[PDB]
């Protein structure tokens, strides 16, 4: 019964891979794995990862100009 500070991240299977892939290069991102659609991450990294995820997801979305 230890209060491990973290953000309860709920995500779809596709997004789950991103967090795992993001954690692959940056080990400190994900503290532990909860389930397929649930994850626990460093509270500080939440701000960074969200912006980092948007940049990666921004690429697959087209921009007119």
């Amino acid at each position: 019964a230890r209060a491990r500070k973290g953000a309860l991240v709920q995500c779809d299977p596709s997004i789950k891979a991103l967090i795992l892939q993001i954690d692959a290069k940056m080990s400190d991102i994900v503290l532990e794995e909860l389930d397929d659609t649930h994850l626990l991450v460093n509270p500080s990294k939440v701000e960074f990862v969200k912006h980092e995820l948007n940049r990666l997801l921004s690429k697959n979305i087209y921009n007119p100009m």
Binding site: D12, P13, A17, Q21, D36, N60, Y62
Partner: protein, 615 residues
Amino acid sequence: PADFVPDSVSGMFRSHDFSYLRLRPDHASRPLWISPSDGRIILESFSPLAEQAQDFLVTIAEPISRPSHIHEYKITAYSLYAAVSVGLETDDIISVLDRLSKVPVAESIINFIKGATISYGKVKLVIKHNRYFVETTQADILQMLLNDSVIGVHSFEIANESVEVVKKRCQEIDYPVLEEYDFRNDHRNPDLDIDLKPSTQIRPYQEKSLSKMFGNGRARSGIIVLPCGAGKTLVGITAACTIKKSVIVLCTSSVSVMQWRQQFLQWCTLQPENCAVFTSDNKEMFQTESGLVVSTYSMVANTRNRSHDSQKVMDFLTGREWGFIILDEVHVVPAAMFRRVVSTIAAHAKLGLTATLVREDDKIGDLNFLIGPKLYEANWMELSQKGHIANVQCAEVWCPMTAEFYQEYLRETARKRMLLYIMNPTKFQACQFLIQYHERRGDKIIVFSDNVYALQEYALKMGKPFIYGSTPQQERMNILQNFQYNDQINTIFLSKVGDTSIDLPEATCLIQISSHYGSRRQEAQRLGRILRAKRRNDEGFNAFFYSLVSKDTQEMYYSTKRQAFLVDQGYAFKVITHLHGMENIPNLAYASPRERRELLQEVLLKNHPLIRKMY
């Protein structure tokens, strides 16, 4: 812009605030807005004089986008060059523009029209006995053309190969050249007596297109753009029929060669004797005084290796001075060597026929001097509501990839990444469910797939015929005929081969599992196959056009980019996140995890007579 107080919100508009001008009391009637700087034109389609200016504006301004209510047009130098050709002067344009513009035509716009509207009509390029003469009606031009560093009533010769250079030089220099053919007074070239049979019917939009080409009475050289299925074949036939001279047709396909000839025989009254087809099968050339040659760009663009059978045809083509050339699917003429046919083949008039006038590279604008300016463009929506072309309910289905496949997606390299998400299990379920649902409805389904390996995988499991480059003409025709006239088969799996200039009247439904990256013309041309629907006038009929795209993949980036031309035309894409009733289907591809993993490994693993008697 003199003595105008900026507004508190003027900062939001970065130098685009065009409120410095004032509005006349007659703004309620004038249907045109004009941007004083960018040259953009905003047209009201729900106001009086809309039809009055719908044709005048198109002639002068090319369309950037024509959605339902507000039409958007832009004036460009190339667009003006097309307009000035058809008996238009600056005074007429200025007078009409002021009479229709809500906002006054700014001096910048006035300056733009003056410069480009005065050069036209001082240099002409004529052809005589396969010799090209740059004839000028005034002697002053000799001091400007003969002294040009590029070149080399007065008439001087110019090299045939140099035509591609001088025409660009003409655009660069003040005077651009115009190609006008006086077929009425041309007697040296033998004539071909052909007229449309009484059964023929001329539709109004085609009639407008022909008029734009025969406005002054002399055949023009340019491009005619009409939506897929509008009847461009008849437009070419009518142009050939009215000129009544030697003609030729070039198409970038083999099956389309028969289609054009088949349409030619039925619509006009040309006898089979004067028609010769120059393809890989037969190469005989008509020996009659005049006739037609329906060939392909590949046969005429080849320069290195021509055999004896084809060499004789080439001499026959080059020796004689032809009068007309028809370029079906003219959106591939400015290529590196397809453009050589225009110069090598001698003709006094050139016609371009392409449903889509766009391409990935910036060479689209080169069509101006290869074949001429743009004569007429027909709006897709206007023809659709008139019953001339079918309506399409374009849809984009989002298929999220399964976790197991997506795990390898991140690691896999881009080259193999395409193959990875093209055969995702989710797309199989969507394609199978959609095909079955439309098959039950009684729809003729065409499935397009650029990836040959994916095409084979779909067909082998689904037990449906597939067509791809390696198939012969006989086999594909047999499959095509079965798919049309037989009730047993209602779906086919086509590839990039049938992406253009193929007539499928019975096709109503289309599915695109995966296709050619960022190419836009492919999306539009493939959509044209189901715009051919024979039953496009029955009440409540709506053709179906689907584009299955994997979520969280680069296909979304490609998909949103390739359909950027249809949105400009007016078609709107609908996002389908989930298909209702898809779970209750009895069986689906790769439903169990075991089957899914089997697919994953297979796709991942993809990358002396005496001696003769002894033996």
